[PDB]
Write a protein that binds this ligand. Structure first.
Ligand SMILES: Nc1ccn([C@@H]2O[C@H](COP(=O)(O)OP(=O)(O)OP(=O)(O)O)C[C@H]2O)c(=O)n1
Ligand SMILES: Nc1ccn([C@@H]2O[C@H](COP(=O)(O)OP(=O)(O)OP(=O)(O)O)C[C@H]2O)c(=O)n1
Ligand SMILES: O=C1C=CN([C@@H]2O[C@H](COP(=O)(O)OP(=O)(O)OP(=O)(O)O)C[C@H]2O)C(O)N1
Ligand SMILES: [Mn+2]
Ligand SMILES: [Mn+2]
Length: 1264
RNA sequence: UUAGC
């Protein structure tokens, strides 16, 4: 550690709260990090006096592995396959030797890559060579699933941990987290690596590079070492920053060692990933004596996902685990995988917790953080053959007699059918009719928005489309000479812009390209990049599904992302007397096939949509005629609408299946097209479609099936008490059944179990394998809840990991910083020990803030000041002579954040600046007689501030584009969007109207006429950058570092004029014994105190924020938030109604709606959040889990504590000021360590009025 | 070649 101490001494003290932080020391540390060689990090590890408790037997078979060759074979289709040994799953990367297949590297003689000789043979067609190349490429792919070299994270840990224990400012004592000499993952990392390197000077087992991965030429290396080491590093960092229990952490290391000890690390990890969750979370409190759980009320309507805290629910044996015992299966799993030692220890401990409190949930959390975080990996061929193969077993098919004759591609399900499909058909028919009935549906703008949804800078199987079109002799414009990426649906859109649906129809059956995705703790999933016509024709399906989810069920739309994964719902459902069954449907995509669902859904939509869509085109699709054979004998022609024409074509594809074109770049020679009937993921229907069937079937069960299959009075009573509208929330294939409790306690466990067995039996009838889980836990959207307490899953957030499906190289330097920030933010959301985490983040950042640059022997260096990370969101540990750890990680981001920390120590700064020569005769309004301009330029505070706001990736704009083809393109884009003249006429109106009432007021008019340009811009930036464009990026950042400044942004200079007075701490908003988020307990002072004083956000953030916009959606390409800002800004700037009416016309609205909303906006009392946008203020993400709405409303007094001040009074017409003022107050409160405090407006330098003009100046100057 | 939200 003397190696580390000597080289980072001063820096360590700065991020440990002992010494102030200075950019001079930060940048040096950066340079030290950059000069540390990989073997040096191991040399440093050697200096650690590890304790015996940090050691455990390392399996000798982790080193000696068999040849890879016996693990593969060539199949009947000549594709290189993984040869199974431990079951159908044994398809991942096998644990084998690999040195024998490498050629030493030219320079790094001790490291090696796959022999070029072997690849050439493989490329020639040699079976043995292909087998070896595949194994080589896949094993390499496995090692790449990390963000940067493991040594960088380790070195950072060493530097951060050299600071020793950290003193808690609030608790007033040092933490008792064991030092590194007790870190078992680290000890293993050093020992395993040292054992591999052996006599070799090079200490690294492998090198994560750009030229690819290279392996240390040791006969002890294994394809499993990269993943294993990656797991140990995460655990190493977490034991120190999450304050994890070392004893548990070892159980986690043991499993990993066993994974490396197995024949396939990846596979073993997958089969045992449930060990920690099963032996703790799903086995808590078989005995219960005390503790408290939340007591929440679900507000009406339940669809708002809004709850209110009502106190605490004392716990007793009355609430002990009533759900079935998983002991037997749990021990069986351990026995089968040689981990019964771990399982047992886990069970024995889980039993000692008889009180539900901070101690026990932290235990669960702790346990669940020890699960491997590797992104499982296997060759594309293997994913495709395992995912697009299995078919649903429809145990009770729809009788063939129950279909009518064909109506084109569809057959109506007779209304005499006795099949359960009867109900599935009614629901889709109803929704389809009502949706097509809505007037909006027929509005040109709406159809433009829909058509735009899939016009993105993402792929759409471009090539395949082109050829399916060539098959019918129809060539698409190639726009030869344009600097944009051709494999984008944006490019596709332009090619198809001027072609009749009849000419592009065939493309609906074109092949699908391969798209892959690796996930932590899950198998890789294949994806289908549908093409523009395929996406277009799918609208009907998507729209009807949306109608169901918005009007007929209780569902959440999103992918996820904490808090908007509706944390509140989880607290409620998991809180006694409430109970929840976690429903899931396995192989959902393979379960939605034509045979039962799609054939029915297609028919119901086609029929229910008939009367309202009649005689009309839809989204560019014409109406037509199709053969009609419904009635026996009677065979005629039927006039169908364009919307129906869509279902007609979509039905053709769903029926045939998808032609998945598989070009496995990891497996030489594995090129094949695989036909599959599994549902598409890349469809705009997918998510919403599955969410819809989910609720529909569950509704059918609870209403029909269930009741009809049991005469059990209790099961019938329970069932009758459940409605999909109140008690069943779902998203995609995930379901959460919430059984509200009574005063008599919770519903009988045995009755619930009966109910569930009926649900299971029910699914088999139509090919669905329900994955039901009744264990006293709530698990929805990968969020874990117990007794009202959320349990973050640290293992699903690998600190070092990163999905990398493709072979392409990582993004150029800068890019990594964003990733490091995201790592920080997860730690804040996951609840790690705030100080330990903040200090480590500083070490990690500093270790990635410097990069070597080239300009032609012009060897320089790009260095980000420490101040750039603050701007990005990382709080200061201690600056300007202030006390240590006064800043919380809830410090806002950007300007709002800069204003907050600076305001919290304004005087300190001034006093310090002066005391250090930074004095002047000019008295600064914010910094008194401090020479703040000369100070910030020297410390690189301005420099860093501006560097933070510059692009972290190369820009392609500026590429020479021949004006003519450039115009043809943007023209094509335009025609695609301006298909319907009515829309265009609308925008034109807004335009001439704008020149009269709005032009001049603001300069950011969002216009549909911008879309073509924004779209082109996107297709451009999607293409690969050039080494030159990379140089231009560095030059920009490097120029901003040279330049000197005299001020901050115009807005931040305005906020600084506002001074406050922090006062009395807020009273608790929730009980202090109440466990709300494991890890967030009295042991994690700042997060914990914030949670308690501020209170938890008890509503769905998506519902909440949906109430801060006048318009929810708009043509993809425009910004809903921009439009909302433009309108409020025009209002705030005194613009006339007609001006807002003009703005709305310009983004597609009908004059009537335009005038209506315009007139509505004018007279509205805009809420804080919504209004705060006029000046680009946004609720910080880190705040999302807290009750910020209440902080704004009741704890940020705008009336000075001692009455009214001339400067503080808010001008008559400047009421909007109050919204902006609330953010500034909140900013300071949230940034200060400890309890939320009530803050009071103390002063506004030039008065409110002056401030308003200052803001309005900014407003009217935006985009000049 | 590398999807929808
Ligand atoms: N002032 C410097 C010099 C080097 N490096 C880092 O060094 C790495 C590769 O170059 P080296 O060969 O390691 O640098 P040298 O300066 O030549 O080595 P030292 O003086 O011991 O000789 C990458 C580069 O960012 C750095 O950050 N700052
Ligand atoms: N923004 C960037 C990123 C990389 N490079 C160039 O790429 C070359 C090597 O790539 P890296 O692997 O990214 O640089 P290293 O110094 O070898 O180490 P790493 O980025 O961790 O620092 C040398 C460097 O000049 C550059 O000029 N500008
Ligand atoms: O990036 C993503 C991630 C999930 N998606 C959808 O959600 C579901 C299923 O969710 P999950 O449980 O994660 O996938 P399964 O195949 O059902 O995993 P398994 O049976 O172990 O549960 C299938 C997809 O349609 C999606 O479309 N895109
Ligand atoms: Mn599933
Ligand atoms: Mn799922």
């Amino acid at each position: 550690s003397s190696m580390i101490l000597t080289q980072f001494g001063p820096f360590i003290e700065s991020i440990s709260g002992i010494t102030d932080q200075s950019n001079d020391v930060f940048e040096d540390a950066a340079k030290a990090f950059s000069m540390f060689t990989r073997s040096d990090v191991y040399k440093a590890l050697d200096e650690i006096p590890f304790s015996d408790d940090a050691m455990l037997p390392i399996p000798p078979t982790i080193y000696t592995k068999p040849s890879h060759d016996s693990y593969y074979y060539i199949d009947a289709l000549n594709r290189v396959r993984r040869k199974t040994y431990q079951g159908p799953d044994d398809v991942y990367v096998p644990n084998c030797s690999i040195v024998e297949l490498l050629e030493p590297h030219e320079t790094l003689t001790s490291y090696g890559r796959l022999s070029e000789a072997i690849e050439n043979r493989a490329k020639d067609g040699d079976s043995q060579a292909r087998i070896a190349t595949t194994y080589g490429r896949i094993a390499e792919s496995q090692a790449r699933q990390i963000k940067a070299p493991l040594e960088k994270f380790v070195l950072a840990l060493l530097v951060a941990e050299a600071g020793g224990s950290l003193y808690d400012p609030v608790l007033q004592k040092y933490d008792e987290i064991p030092d590194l000499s007790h870190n078992c993952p680290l000890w293993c990392f050093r020992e395993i690596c040292r054992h591999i390197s052996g006599p070799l000077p090079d200490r690294a087992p492998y090198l994560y590079l750009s030229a690819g991965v290279f392996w240390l030429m040791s006969p002890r290396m294994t394809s499993a070492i990269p993943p294993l080491l990656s797991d140990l590093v995460n655990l190493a960092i977490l034991q120190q920053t999450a304050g994890l229990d070392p004893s548990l952490v070892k159980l986690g290391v043991q499993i990993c060692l066993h994974a490396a000890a197995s024949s396939s690390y990846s596979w073993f990890i997958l089969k045992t990933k449930s060990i920690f969750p099963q032996n703790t979370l799903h086995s808590m409190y078989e005995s219960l004596e005390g503790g408290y759980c939340p007591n929440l009320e679900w507000l009406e309507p339940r669809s708002d996902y809004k709850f209110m805290y009502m106190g605490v629910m004392p716990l007793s044996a009355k609430y002990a685990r009533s759900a079935p015992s998983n002991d037997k299966k749990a021990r069986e799993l351990g026995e089968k995988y040689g981990l019964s030692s771990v399982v047992g220890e886990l069970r024995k401990r889980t039993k000692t917790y008889v009180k539900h409190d901070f101690a026990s949930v932290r235990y669960i959390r702790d346990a669940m953080a020890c699960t491997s975080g590797i992104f499982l990996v296997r060759t594309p061929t293997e994913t495709v053959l395992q995912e697009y193969t299995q078919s649903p077993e429809i145990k009770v098919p729809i009788p063939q007699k129950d279909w009518t004759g064909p109506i084109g591609e569809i057959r109506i399900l007779k209304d005499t059918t006795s099949s359960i499909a009867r109900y599935l058909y009614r629901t889709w028919y109803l929704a389809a009719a009502r949706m097509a009935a809505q007037p909006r549906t027929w509005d040109p703008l709406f159809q433009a928005i829909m058509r735009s949804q899939y016009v993105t800078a993402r792929g759409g199987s471009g090539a395949a489309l082109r050829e399916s079109l060539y098959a019918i002799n129809v060539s698409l414009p190639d726009f030869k000479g344009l600097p944009v990426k051709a494999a984008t649906k944006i490019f596709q859109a332009a090619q198809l812009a001027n072609l009749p649906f009849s000419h592009t129809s065939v493309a609906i059956l074109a092949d699908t390209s391969m798209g892959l995705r690796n996930q932590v703790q899950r198998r890789p999933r294949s994806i289908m990049p549908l093409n523009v016509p395929q996406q277009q024709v799918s609208a009907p399906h998507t729209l009807t599904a949306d109608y169901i989810n918005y009007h007929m069920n209780l569902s959440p739309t999103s992918g996820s992302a904490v808090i908007e994964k509706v944390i509140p719902l989880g607290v409620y459902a998991s809180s006694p007397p409430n109970q929840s069954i976690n429903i899931d449907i396995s192989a959902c995509d393979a379960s939605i096939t034509w045979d039962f669902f799609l054939s029915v859904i297609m028919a119901a939509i086609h029929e229910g949509v008939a009367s309202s869509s009649i005689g009309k085109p839809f989204m560019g699709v014409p109406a037509s005629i199709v053969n009609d054979e419904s009635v026996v004998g009677v065979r005629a022609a039927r006039p169908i609408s364009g919307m129906q024409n869509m279902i007609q074509h979509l039905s053709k594809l769903y029926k045939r299946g998808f032609s998945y074109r598989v070009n496995d770049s990891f497996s030489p020679g594995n090129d094949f097209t695989h036909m599959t009937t599994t549902f598409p993921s890349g469809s705009t229907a997918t998510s919403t479609e599955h969410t819809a069937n989910n609720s529909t079937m569950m509704e059918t069960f609870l209403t029909v099936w269930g009741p009809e299959h049991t005469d059990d009075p209790d099961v019938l009573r329970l069932m009758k008490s459940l409605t999909i509208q109140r008690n069943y929330v779902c998203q995609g294939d995930d379901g959460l059944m919430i059984i509200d409790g009574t005063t008599a306690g919770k519903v009988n466990s045995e009755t619930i179990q009966n109910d569930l067995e009926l649900i299971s039996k029910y699914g088999e009838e139509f090919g669905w394998k329900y994955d039901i889980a009744y264990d006293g836990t709530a698990e929805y959207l990968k969020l874990y809840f117990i007794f009202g307490c959320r349990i973050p899953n640290l293992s699903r957030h690998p600190i070092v990991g990163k999905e990398r499906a493709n072979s392409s190289a990582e993004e150029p330097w800068p890019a990594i910083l964003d990733q490091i920030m995201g790592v920080f933010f997860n730690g804040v959301h996951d609840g790690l020990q705030w100080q330990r985490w903040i200090r480590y983040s500083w070490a990690l950042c500093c270790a990635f803030s410097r990069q070597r640059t080239m300009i032609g022997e012009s060897v320089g260096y790009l260095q980000y000041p420490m101040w750039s990370f603050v701007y990005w969101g990382l709080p200061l540990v201690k600056a300007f002579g202030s006390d240590p750890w006064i800043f919380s990680w809830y410090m806002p981001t950007g300007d709002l954040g800069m204003y907050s920390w600076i305001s919290l120590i304004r005087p300190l700064m001034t006093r310090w600046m002066v005391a250090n020569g930074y004095v002047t005769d000019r008295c600064s309004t914010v910094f008194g007689n401090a020479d703040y301009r000369r100070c910030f330029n020297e410390l690189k505070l301005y420099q860093g501030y501006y560097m933070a706001q510059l692009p972290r990736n190369p820009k392609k704009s500026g590429r020479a584009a021949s004006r003519e083809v450039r115009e043809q393109f943007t023209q094509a884009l335009s025609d695609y969007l301006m298909q319907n003249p009515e829309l265009k006429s609308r925008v034109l109106r807004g335009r001439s109207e704008w020149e009269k009432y709005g032009a001049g007021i603001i300069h950011n008019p969002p216009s549909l006429f911008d879309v073509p340009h924004k779209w082109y811009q996107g297709a451009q930036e999607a293409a690969i950058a050039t080494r030159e464009e990379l140089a231009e990026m560095d030059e920009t950042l490097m120029r901003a570092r040279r330049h000197s400044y005299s001020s901050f942004s115009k807005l931040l200079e305005a906020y600084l004029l506002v001074k406050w007075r922090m006062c009395e701490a807020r009273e608790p908003s929730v009980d202090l014994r109440l466990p709300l988020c494991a890890g967030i307990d009295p042991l994690n002072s700042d997060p914990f105190l914030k949670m308690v004083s501020v209170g938890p956000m008890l509503q769905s953030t998506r519902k909440y924020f949906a109430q801060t916009l006048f318009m929810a959606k708009t043509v993809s390409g425009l910004d809903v938030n921009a439009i909302d800002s433009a309108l409020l800004r025009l209002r705030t700037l005194g613009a006339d109604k007609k001006a807002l009416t003009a703005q709305l016309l310009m983004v597609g609205l009908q004059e009537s709606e335009a005038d209506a909303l315009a007139g509505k906006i004018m007279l509205q009392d805009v809420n804080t959040v919504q209004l705060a946008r006029v000046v680009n203020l946004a609720v910080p993400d880190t705040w999302m889990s807290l009750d910020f709405d209440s902080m704004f409303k009741h704890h940020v007094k705008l009336l000075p504590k001692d009455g009214r001040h001339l400067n503080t009074d808010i001008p008559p017409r400047m009421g909007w000021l109050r919204a902006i003022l609330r953010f500034l107050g909140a900013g300071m409160v949230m940034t200060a360590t400890g309890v939320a405090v009530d803050i009071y407006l103390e002063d506004i330098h030039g008065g409110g009025r002056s401030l308003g003009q200052r803001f309005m100046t900014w407003m009217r100057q935006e985009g000049r």
